[PDB]
Amino acid sequence: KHPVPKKKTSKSKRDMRRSHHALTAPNLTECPQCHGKKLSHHICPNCGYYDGRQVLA
């Protein structure tokens, strides 16, 4: 029992591994009213608009 790594992993390796941790930036749209930005199919967090006006102020 008790596996353990045989050898330090190179800085190079370690970083090759990390080639996939890129965050994915939001696709962001600009609210058709109050004008800041929002997520598709969410309520625009600036005004509160989702066609008329749902969340409060």
């Binding site: 997520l39 199919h41 969410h42 309520i43 989702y50 749902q54 969340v55």
Partner: protein
């Protein structure tokens, strides 16, 4: 695998006390804020309970009363809201995505009548 419903990391009793509490709450106040999922999972239980209350007879009251343990809310859903929904073939509710919370990263949401 056509199975249906959500485990919601809970035991059968919990799962039930959930849908009942959140039903009681949504009916107590027209709209509530909750996890997007718990919402998804709440919509059809409450919508149905409405359809039950839409009967008006005493049977349908006692029926609703098993799932909804607060008199005042029962009385509300029997006498006030079911009669309003009178003409709508179901779809008594809707869901809105508010979005991500700070503590635990979770898309909240809004559910209402």
């Amino acid at each position: 695998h056509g199975k249906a419903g959500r485990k919601l990391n809970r035991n059968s009793s919990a799962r039930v006390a959930l849908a009942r509490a959140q039903a009681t709450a949504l009916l107590r106040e027209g709209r509530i804020q909750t996890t997007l999922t718990k919402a998804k999972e709440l919509r059809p239980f409450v919508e149905q309970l409405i359809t039950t209350a839409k009967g008006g007879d005493l049977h349908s009251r006692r029926l609703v009363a098993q799932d909804i343990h607060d008199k005042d809310v029962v009385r509300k859903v029997m006498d006030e809201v079911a009669p309003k929904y009178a003409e709508r073939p179901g779809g008594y509710t809707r869901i809105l995505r508010v979005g991500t919370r700070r503590g635990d990263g979770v898309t909240m949401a809004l559910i209402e009548l």
